[PDB]
Scaffold this active site. Structure first.
Site, PDB file in Angstrom:
ATOM      1  N   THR A  87      -6.786   4.658   5.564  1.00  0.00           N
ATOM      2  CA  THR A  87      -6.739   3.333   4.964  1.00  0.00           C
ATOM      3  C   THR A  87      -7.482   2.361   5.887  1.00  0.00           C
ATOM      4  OG1 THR A  87      -4.684   3.039   6.171  1.00  0.00           O
ATOM      5  CG2 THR A  87      -4.505   3.467   3.782  1.00  0.00           C
TER       6      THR A  87
ATOM      7  N   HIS B 173       0.832  -1.221   0.000  1.00  0.00           N
ATOM      8  CA  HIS B 173       0.000   0.000   0.000  1.00  0.00           C
ATOM      9  C   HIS B 173       0.868   1.274   0.000  1.00  0.00           C
ATOM     10  CE1 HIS B 173      -3.249  -2.731   0.811  1.00  0.00           C
ATOM     11  NE2 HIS B 173      -2.677  -3.128   1.934  1.00  0.00           N
TER      12      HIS B 173
ATOM     13  N   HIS C 272       2.156   9.040   0.672  1.00  0.00           N
ATOM     14  CA  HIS C 272       1.084   8.802  -0.280  1.00  0.00           C
ATOM     15  C   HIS C 272       1.489   9.712  -1.439  1.00  0.00           C
ATOM     16  CE1 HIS C 272      -1.671   6.976   2.688  1.00  0.00           C
ATOM     17  NE2 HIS C 272      -1.039   7.761   3.534  1.00  0.00           N
TER      18      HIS C 272
END
Ligand SMILES: [O][B+]1([O])O[C]C2=C1[C]=C([N]C(=S)[N]C1=[C][C]=[C][C]=[C]1)[C]=[C]2
Ligand SMILES: [Zn+2]
Length: 256
Positions: free
Chosen positions: A196, A61, A93
């Protein structure tokens, strides 16, 4: 399982994690004109001098740099926080393009990426207990804008070739996270959640006003990572960001 694809992305998470439609979800858009200056908010206290990094890993991720949190080595205190929050790890991110990638937005503006320094409230004993509490975590969020290179970030960029796919990790000792901070610690703060799954509403968000500058080459290398595991079809790890969620009944406060 969950991801950032068309079939398992943010719009699908609510099916397995109904809290996705909760009352204090993150990220959110920070409307600078609506944020309330709170002269009662204390300066943040970032004490990372004794930080002990251990390793870096690709968990499918994002890539996470983990720290030894078995003692009060690197802690975040002050600001809107009550107590001591211990740094456990940081990750980013980012986007497929420089014009997107951050989770939080500022007056709808998206940055190229967003760094999250994750800390847990020591009064809860361990990270697992902390995430079950409304004030269990304090995440320090920092925006990245493409411009000049960030010297401190280069150590992280250079090791990414060694953790290209999901499940790969590499030793990453003696990394100083202070090299990732902007000059100013002015910030906005609001109560939110993990961005998340499990999307737990256990986070006091502290987002810095001042972005750090990173070069186009540095973020480009983030984009070479893979969501998949070795031996599986290649899926570039890009756009691992959740879009802004409804602010609902919350106030964003500014320290400046
Ligand atoms: O959404 B985020 O990317 O942004 C900020 C952030 C994120 C993820 C985590 N979660 C971590 S480190 N572990 C975890 C694993 C399973 C259950 C609960 C927590 C912590 C902080
Ligand atoms: Zn994050």
């Amino acid at each position: 399982h969950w991801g950032y694809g068309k079939h398992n992305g943010p719009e699908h998470w609510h099916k397995d994690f109904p809290i996705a439609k909760g009352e204090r979800q993150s990220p959110v858009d920070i409307d600078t004109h609506t944020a309330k200056y709170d002269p009662s908010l204390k300066p943040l206290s970032v004490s990372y001098d004794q930080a002990t990094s251990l390793r870096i890993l690709n968990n499918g991720h994002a890539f996470n740099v983990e720290f030894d949190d078995s003692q009060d080595k690197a802690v975040l205190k002050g600001g809107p926080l009550d107590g001591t929050y211990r740094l456990i790890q940081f990750h980013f991110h980012w986007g497929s393009l420089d014009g997107q990638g951050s989770e939080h937005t500022v007056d709808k503006k998206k940055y190229a990426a967003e760094l999250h320094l994750v800390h847990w409230n020591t009064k809860y004993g361990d990270f697992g207990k902390a995430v079950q509490q409304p004030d269990g975590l304090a995440v320090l969020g920092i925006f990245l804008k493409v411009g000049s290179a960030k010297p401190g970030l280069q150590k992280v960029v250079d090791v990414l070739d060694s953790i290209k796919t999901k499940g790969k990790s590499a030793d990453f000792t003696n990394f100083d996270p202070r090299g990732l901070l902007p000059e100013s610690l002015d910030y906005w703060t609001y109560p939110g959640s993990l961005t998340t799954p499990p999307l737990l509403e256990c986070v006091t968000w502290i987002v810095l006003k001042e972005p750090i500058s990173v070069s186009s080459e540095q973020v480009l290398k983030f984009r070479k990572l893979n969501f998949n595991g070795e031996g599986e079809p290649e899926e570039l790890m890009v756009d691992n960001w959740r879009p802004a969620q409804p602010l609902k009944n919350r106030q964003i406060k500014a320290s400046f």
